[model samples]
Target: PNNYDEAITRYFASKYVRAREGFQLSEAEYNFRLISLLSSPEEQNRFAKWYSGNNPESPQNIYHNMTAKVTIKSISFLSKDLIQVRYYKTIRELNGKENISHWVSILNFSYINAHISTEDRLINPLGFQVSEYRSDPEVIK
Candidate 1:
């Protein structure tokens, strides 16, 4: 939701495997944005700093405050913890859900990208190292 700000526009297309708070379904718009970037800790530091004041089209360090609104082909939520979702993207298969439920899954998802691209790190805090911090990449550009 990018805190319900313009920054939220970034996560308009992403594959969300985890959610937390509750099903965040906007009125007249069920096309939910399944986002998973760096946590608030990561956003406050990583994703925020990258695009806080950088060029929108930087070459090497071009990190945008992004988001992801998944165009789901089909979502088969078996249970609050058990689900089987399929999307048309790199991650075609997902098995488990931890500390995530149906409502929370759609509303408040987790910000942990175990599988991310180099650009993704630009807006993700999960892409960190020992005693070192990294970028807070977003799902969208």
Candidate 2:
């Protein structure tokens, strides 16, 4: 697999699949794994908020028995260290209905160093971190 493309694809795939399952991993471990992929505190907090709302009683517990499929539509490099990825995601529910959405994610790549923990570096050797993520529903005629 192409390391760059694989990393990008795995990041989104892991995000959606984990969000759907909600509690597959312990909160600490979940944060440990995912937080490394985000570049800033703002993005990290956004991810934390999303995962925190996974409780059964929370109004944000929207995913249940759902599966997400992501297809990368394009990958563009704006500069040596910045890249943009656009993709389509389809979420299928247990009832057979599906919702399609389009997403754009920007990732910044830097050299991995001692600042990043050994464990995190092992997972992300290239220091690719997501700086932004956005999504919207796709309307099909």
Candidate 3:
């Protein structure tokens, strides 16, 4: 039983088929690019070239224009410390800076302040931007 069927076990254990509806493939592409992005300036430049639709080597930002419609939203929610999410909105992925032009519904929120935690999601080592959040209420679209 220990080695019966791992693939089957994983398949049934978690039915993760978000691609069927709620999931966006571009998010996966972003993940792929982001994984490649957090490596070097050269790597980031390359990733940004594709994702940002611009070229770093060019005199002007020659972006390979895509009609993805993904913009970063500046949505900030304060549960305990402050939950600020930065995401990209495509027909999919959304950023905290681009969340302004839509309706937001607070699905759920709470401050789980008991002992401690490590900050990860809130900080972008890439220096994306945080001040934009203060410009408007970072809500859902």
Candidate 4:
């Protein structure tokens, strides 16, 4: 996929499309670049550089954490290029059968536009950041 792959955005809205067809499943951190790419290609590359720099210890790198899967319950446009998504994420710990967590959150994505998809995906612009996530850590489990 190119830097601002619209195909990325299109299939992102589906939340069901895979990179290849049926071989691999899409994980949250794996696809995080899609969101970052919405901001700019540079941001995505920066994330990659940082991830490679720190590898398994990079706190900022989503890949540092265990696997996470997000399922969207709702998506809306509060403003152009601004997407509001309500979803739940399930994270699995490194140890098998010992730890698992599920939490719900409402996240705001900036710089969204209709051009990306009729599905209302974020468009390339100033930046693509999780402007806000309103999930209480205290209640995360």
Show pairs that collide, candidate 2.
Answer: none
| Root-mean-square deviation of every model | 16.8, 5.8, 17.3, 8.9
Lowest lDDT sum, 10 consecutive residues, model 1, at 27-36
Q: Which runs of model 1 end up more than 4 angstroms from their true locations?
A: 1-70, 90-141
Tens digits of per-residue lDDT for model 2, 26-126: 35364446554544556556655655655554313554456556666766677655666666767777899987777665655444333677776666555
TM-score of 3: 0.20
Off by over 4 Å in 4: 1-39, 53-65, 97-141
State the displacement of the C-alpha of residue 134, model 2, in Å, after optimal TM-score superposition: 3.2
**How many clashes show up per model?**
18, 0, 22, 4
Candidate maximizing TM-score: 2
Please report the TM-score between candidate 4 and the true structure.
0.41
RMSD of 4: 8.9
> Model 3 over residues 1-141: C-alpha lDDT tens digits?
212233332221122111111123445554443333222345345434544425453212321222223233333444422234333423322332322233221211111222222232222222221111111223554
Candidate 3 at 141: error in angstroms?
A: 9.3
Candidate 1 accuracy as TM-score: 0.20
Residue-by-residue lDDT tens digits, candidate 4, 1-141: 122343343334334212101111244454444545542455446545544536663323442345554555555555443444445554454674333334333443433332454332433332334444333222545
